[PDB]
Amino acid sequence: RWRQTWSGPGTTKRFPETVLARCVKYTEIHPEMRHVDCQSVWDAFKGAFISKHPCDITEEDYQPLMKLGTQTVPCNKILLWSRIKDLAHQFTQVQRDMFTLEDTLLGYLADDLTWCGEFATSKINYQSCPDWRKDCSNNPVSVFWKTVSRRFAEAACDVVHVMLDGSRSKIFDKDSTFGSVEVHNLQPEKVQTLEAWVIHGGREDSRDLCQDPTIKELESIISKRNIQFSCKNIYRPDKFLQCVKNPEDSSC
């Protein structure tokens, strides 16, 4: 209609079918999750937000889902990212040099989807869903991501990489999920170093963005956790990707 209860997009069309089909597909590829019952996954997922006011969702609502989707990826090969989705995923698709959150089952099930329910009825809302800004932050989508990204950062160890969008004006941004959750969930007992790869946009001959003020801030923030900091410009993202796929032939 012309009004809409909430200001964000409604649940993605086909959401139940999509999530079940992703679970089936993921548990076909990944032998360590080949024990998972996909219908039980869907039910645990749907139970977190059906018949619940979509501005009252808690991390508890998602605990049965997080249990069924329990998974360990190698803790020393984690790739976090911020505002540079495409290249982080492309990079991990190549030879599985690292794992992002969206290469875990739970991140895989939800990537790029929206969903909410209603306090009123047991139906899925396919017309609109709370916006984190205009409506409430404790909505099904934002809660889910906050919870699974905390857990994924908490699991990381050794050297943890992060890819940042060097086009952004705030290359490290305290308001992003990386700056507000993941970075404050790297464990000081386990993480030796965080290494940022700052991805350069197009043409420029370009500044050394590892000296950017927000990078120096990130550096001094993670030093209180007793984590070392390293930073690398990626000047040419498509030649980066090229070298990643053609390991050897080291023109570089």
UniProtKB/Swiss-Prot annotation:
Classify the protein's membrane topology as the record does: Single-pass type II membrane protein
Primary site of residence: other
Disulfide bridge map = 23-38, 55-136, 116-129, 210-231, 243-252
Catalytic residues, per the record, are 75, 157
Provide the protein's localization: Cell surface; Membrane
Q: What is the effect of changing residue 129 to A?
A: Loss of cADPR hydrolase and ADP-ribosyl cyclase activity
Name the keywords, alphabetized: Diabetes mellitus, Disulfide bond, Glycoprotein, Hydrolase, Membrane, NAD, NADP, Receptor, Signal-anchor, Transferase, Transmembrane, Transmembrane helix
Note from the entry? A cell surface antigen recognized in lymophocytes by multiple mAbs.
Cite the record's note on assembly. Homodimer.
Give the family, as the similarity comment puts it: Belongs to the ADP-ribosyl cyclase family.
Function field: Synthesizes cyclic ADP-ribose (cADPR), a second messenger for glucose-induced insulin secretion. Synthesizes the Ca(2+) mobilizer nicotinate-adenine dinucleotide phosphate, NAADP(+), from 2'-phospho-cADPR and nicotinic acid, as well as from NADP(+) and nicotinic acid. At both pH 5.0 and pH 7.4 preferentially transforms 2'-phospho-cADPR into NAADP(+), while preferentially cleaving NADP(+) to cADPR and ADPRP rather than into NADDP(+). Has cADPR hydrolase activity.
State what protein this is by name: ADP-ribosyl cyclase/cyclic ADP-ribose hydrolase 1
Q: What is the lineage of its organism?
A: Eukaryota, Metazoa, Chordata, Craniata, Vertebrata
